[PDB]
Amino acid sequence: CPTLGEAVTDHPDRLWAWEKFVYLDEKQHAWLPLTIEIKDRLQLRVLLRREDVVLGRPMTPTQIGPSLLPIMWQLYPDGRYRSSDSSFWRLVYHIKIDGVEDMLLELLPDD
Amino acid sequence: CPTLGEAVTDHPDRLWAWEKFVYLDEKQHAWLPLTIEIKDRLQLRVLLRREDVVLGRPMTPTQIGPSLLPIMWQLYPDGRYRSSDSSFWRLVYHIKIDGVEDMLLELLPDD
Structure with a gap:
């Protein structure tokens, strides 16, 4: 009855900005950034959700x-995503809840 | 015992970006944008919280x-905030919860 989801192991290999707030992957799947959270006024955490738009x-x-x-x-190759701004982002999680597939990316301060 | 807050009627008249994620008002009070929410891939909702940094x-x-x-x-004069990008934002709410003062601004599509 409560939220019952599961982890997804197949992550998109590429996300292209299609619009200001819409990304598409290699399978032509649309991902919508719904929330951006700012931690310690430095670290960004963005939640993307799959949606047929x-x-x-x-x-x-x-x-x-x-x-x-x-x-x-x-x-x-190491499982992290490289941004076109040259920054690196860690995949915090990729899950599916009652069909809803969410992915959470968090910005890292390396090279 | 649960969240017991109250509305605040004195809103800052000016917010200056001090850093990427830190704003200061005319009273030299710091406001931290903690969350940015994207509605219908168009409307922005940003939550600012007062913090002594x-x-x-x-x-x-x-x-x-x-x-x-x-x-x-x-x-x-009409109670809305004008952004330096020329956009107008509506003050959704300004409250105080156990000392925590939060303000929620939502972007409007007018002139």
Whole structure:
């Protein structure tokens, strides 16, 4: 009756910013950043949720404009994602709850 | 025993970005944006909380860099805040809970 979910082991290998607040992976799956949490005024934690949305033409980095989120995320061999801003993000979790698939990425201060 | 708070009627008239994630008002009070919520991939809702932090020299708009948050918010005669990006934000609420003073601003699509 309460929230009963499970871990997902297949993470997208690439996320492209399609719009300001919509990303698409290699399977043409849309991920929506719903929440951005700021820890110690430095660390960012963004929650992305899978959703079937109606999309047309992708936007350019210019039309998208200034943001806290990268134009693209790329999965590295060590399991972390590299942002197009050259930063590295840790995958805190990737789960599925009653169909709802959520992924939580947290920014790291390395190289 | 549970959360027992109360509304606050004195809202800051100006918020200046001091750092990427720290704002200061006219009373030299620091407000920390803790959460940014994205509604319908368009509307932004940012939660700011008052906190006594140690601050040195303010940063310039350049050092601050790209963001979803404005360099400054200004209280207008109608009770809404005007962002330095020329957008208007509605004050959803301003309360105090066991000392914790929170303010929630939500972006509006007008002029």
